Amino acid sequence: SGFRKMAFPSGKVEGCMVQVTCGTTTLNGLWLDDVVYCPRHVICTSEDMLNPNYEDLLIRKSNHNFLVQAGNVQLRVIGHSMQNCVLKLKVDTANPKTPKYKFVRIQPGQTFSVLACYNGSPSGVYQCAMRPNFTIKGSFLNGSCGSVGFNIDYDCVSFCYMHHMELPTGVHAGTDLEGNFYGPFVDRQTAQAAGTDTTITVNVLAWLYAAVINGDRWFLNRFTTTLNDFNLVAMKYNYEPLTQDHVDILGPLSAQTGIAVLDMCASLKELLQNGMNGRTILGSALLEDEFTPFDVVRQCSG
Amino acid sequence: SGFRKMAFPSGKVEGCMVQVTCGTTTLNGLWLDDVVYCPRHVICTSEDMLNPNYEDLLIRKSNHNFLVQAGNVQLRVIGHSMQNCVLKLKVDTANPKTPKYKFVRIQPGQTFSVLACYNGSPSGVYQCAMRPNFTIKGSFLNGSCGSVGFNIDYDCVSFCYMHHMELPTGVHAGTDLEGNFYGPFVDRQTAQAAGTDTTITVNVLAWLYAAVINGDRWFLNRFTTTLNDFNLVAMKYNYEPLTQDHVDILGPLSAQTGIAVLDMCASLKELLQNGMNGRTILGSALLEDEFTPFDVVRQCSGVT
Ligand SMILES: O=C(N[C@H]1CCCC[C@H]1Nc1c(C(=O)N2CCOCC2)cc(Br)cc1[N+](=O)[O-])c1cc(=O)[nH]c2ccccc12
Ligand SMILES: O=C(N[C@H]1CCCC[C@H]1Nc1c(C(=O)N2CCOCC2)cc(Br)cc1[N+](=O)[O-])c1cc(=O)[nH]c2ccccc12
């Protein structure tokens, strides 16, 4: 029993973190085989960031303009190139702690663990969801760029996020490990803002199943509702529409608890237009949307 | 910017987790140097659990009744002894991945990270507080016993919790690495119940400081308070009383924000009186009490 916001164990990823310095900028790099991956803005001065020409800036650098430190050993850089917004630094030593890994690009609504790092050293791990507006509500200070987000399946690390920036509202933006940005953002110091966000409805329903699994049942009701009748109510409260595929993805949880998906929607609808009336669910006064159906199944089954 | 319930990186502890089996009972062990630590109830059948005499049960065991597995490798058990509620299995191999470590016993209100494990394999990490009633609000299933809680200070892992059981209300109880339970709980399947819990007041204040550090001031007010008036009010909301040691512990946060501790106490009093009125603080609609002052300074300063 119990339900916590649980991150994946971070050991496989700690073994890949390094410090990348170029000029006056120091940040974090990801060391996999004989390549270090890090944000391309490491090569910019603050004046460069106002309007950077990365191709032109990178040509002015040689391999010796990059210092890479893993622990107390300085890795020799033998080549450099860009892929989209990530810099790839070839080093003369392969990382012996390189795990089985893949680069994957995730969708809004999917969760992942973040290993927050500074100067190549881990500070902590936490669990994040990609918001529908493609930001993440992270915890990042100066020097955090290059920290990565990831999932683990069996022995294989799926890197999905590399951190690049903080927006004026204090939320964060980054790229996949192929350097493609999540959301309409650019690595330039210019006016940028997070769009209006919505709530990940499939994740809220999964978390309501987690609460029922853990004995919170006061919000279940006698009513039922159609998917289109629910979707019309949800859209008025800035909730993402529920698709039929979402319902199929909630099948396992509905079978475990015996509560039809549309019966849980009927409860969620009543929660949205009535509130919680001073009560809590799993220790929260808000409807939580940073647990996917798979996350609930995993934590409630090992 | 931002504020998250952040756990310590788990790598140094991941390399210490093993699987311990005795009979048909399996659970997790902690392998440090040539010793594996685990809950002593690994030697019990379910019939033994109502009124076990662990001295009598252990004397009937031999070294070869314990199978300890680290990955695909079996570790030969060469000795065994009990210390309070933990079993110490000596093995013929010292753990090459042993970190620098310490055994500590924490206070009510302090936090630590839990590496939840099953069959010797870590499956997740999260941050916990020792509640005032000496339980933790964990996430644990059958097979999780022997999972550990820990902090990191400098280069050293401070182990502070080993998991033993789940109480009827779904909260959790365990021991330090000496085998002494937190609270009045015992490793018997007898009627046990968490007492009534309280809110960790010094942690709520530290968290309000994190909100200020992150740029929010809407909950401050022009009032101050005496410490004794603050405690008279706060205890009517089932908040733990605030001591002068606590006030000194909030010093660094108070000095960084320019808000005196007793002025933050005034704000807390008003929050308890009014609630948030449809607002949130660092993403929460309730007053969070599972961040210590040291947690706040660490996450707001980038300690690695
Ligand atoms: O070091 C961080 N950022 C650097 C990294 C490389 C240089 C540009 C900058 N990134 C941004 C930012 C930005 O982060 N800031 C933060 C406030 O000051 C300026 C604007 C905004 C836009 Br718009 C575009 C970019 N960009 O294109 O890289 C940074 C990261 C973090 O998560 N949180 C922090 C908290 C405090 C201070 C710094 C950070
Ligand atoms: O395997 C777990 N526990 C086992 C470990 C071996 C000894 C007995 C039992 N510990 C207890 C418990 C207890 O946990 N339970 C669990 C529900 O059914 C019975 C009562 C209560 C008291 Br009172 C005393 C003890 N004791 O003395 O060990 C266990 C751990 C967990 O965190 N969460 C779970 C969720 C579901 C099922 C099991 C667990």
CATH number for position B193: 2.40.10.10
B41 catalytically annotated: yes
Q: Are A99 and A156 in contact (CB under 8 A)?
A: yes
Residue with structure tokens 């490793």? B187
| Residue where one domain finishes, among candidates A197, A228, A254 | A197
Q: Is the CB of A49 under 6 A from ligand 1?
A: yes
| Residue where one domain finishes, among candidates A65, A99, A133 | A99
Q: Residue A267: which CATH number?
A: 1.10.1840.10
User: Resolution reached, in Å?
Assistant: 1.9
- Asked if A11's CB is within 8 angstroms of B170's CB, the reply is no
* Alpha carbon of A84 to ligand 1 centroid (Å): 19
Q: What amino acid is encoded at A260 in this protein?
A: A
Residue with structure tokens 């507006």? A133
Same structural domain, A213 and A289: yes
Q: B304 to chain A: nearest residue by CA?
A: A123
Ligand 2 atom nearest to B191, measured from its CA: 23
- Asked if A215's CB is within 8 angstroms of B170's CB, the reply is yes
Same structural domain, B116 and B41: no
- In 3D space, the residue among A227, A198, A219, A222 whose CA is nearest the CA of residue A268 turns out to be A219
The boundaries of the domain holding residue A107 are: 1-14+100-197
Helix (H) or strand (E) run with residue A231 in it: helix A227-236
Same structural domain, B112 and B180: yes
Give CA–CA dist A296/B264, Å, rounded: 37
- Asked if A302's CB is within 8 angstroms of B143's CB, the reply is yes
Degrees (nearest 5) of the Cα angle B226, B232, B234?
95
Burial letters A273-301, b for 16+ CB under 10 A, else e: eeeeeeeebbeebebbbbbbbebbbebbe
The CA–CA distances, whole Å, from A3 to A114, A155, B115, B117 equal: 19, 24, 14, 15
Q: Which residues pair with B21 in a beta bridge?
A: B26, B67
Structure tokens that stand for B141 in this block: 């299933």
A170 interaction partners in chain B (CB closer than 8 Å): 1-2, 214-215
The CA–CA distances, whole Å, from A220 to A269, A274, B25, B169 equal: 11, 13, 38, 20
| Residue where one domain finishes, among candidates A178, A197, A216 | A197
* Alpha carbon of B173 to ligand 2 centroid (Å): 10
Q: Are B113 and B7 in contact (CB under 8 A)?
A: yes
Which of B165, B172, B181 most suits a substitution to test ligand 2, by most atoms within 8 Å of the C-beta? B165
Task: Please state the domain count of chain B.
Answer: 3
Q: Are A77 and A64 in contact (CB under 8 A)?
A: yes
Q: B138 to chain A: nearest residue by CA?
A: A2
Give CA–CA dist A251/A153, Å, rounded: 21
Among protein residues, the one whose CA lies closest to atom 22 of ligand 1: A189
Give CA–CA dist B6/B296, Å, rounded: 10
Same structural domain, A193 and A239: no
Q: B168 to chain A: nearest residue by CA?
A: A1
Determine the residue among A3, A6, A157 to mutate to test chain B binding: the one whose Cβ has the most chain B Cβ atoms within 10 Å: A6
Alpha helices in chain B (DSSP H): 11-14, 54-59, 201-213, 227-234, 244-249, 251-257, 261-274, 293-299
Q: Is the CB of A187 under 6 A from ligand 1?
A: yes
Same structural domain, B83 and B136: no
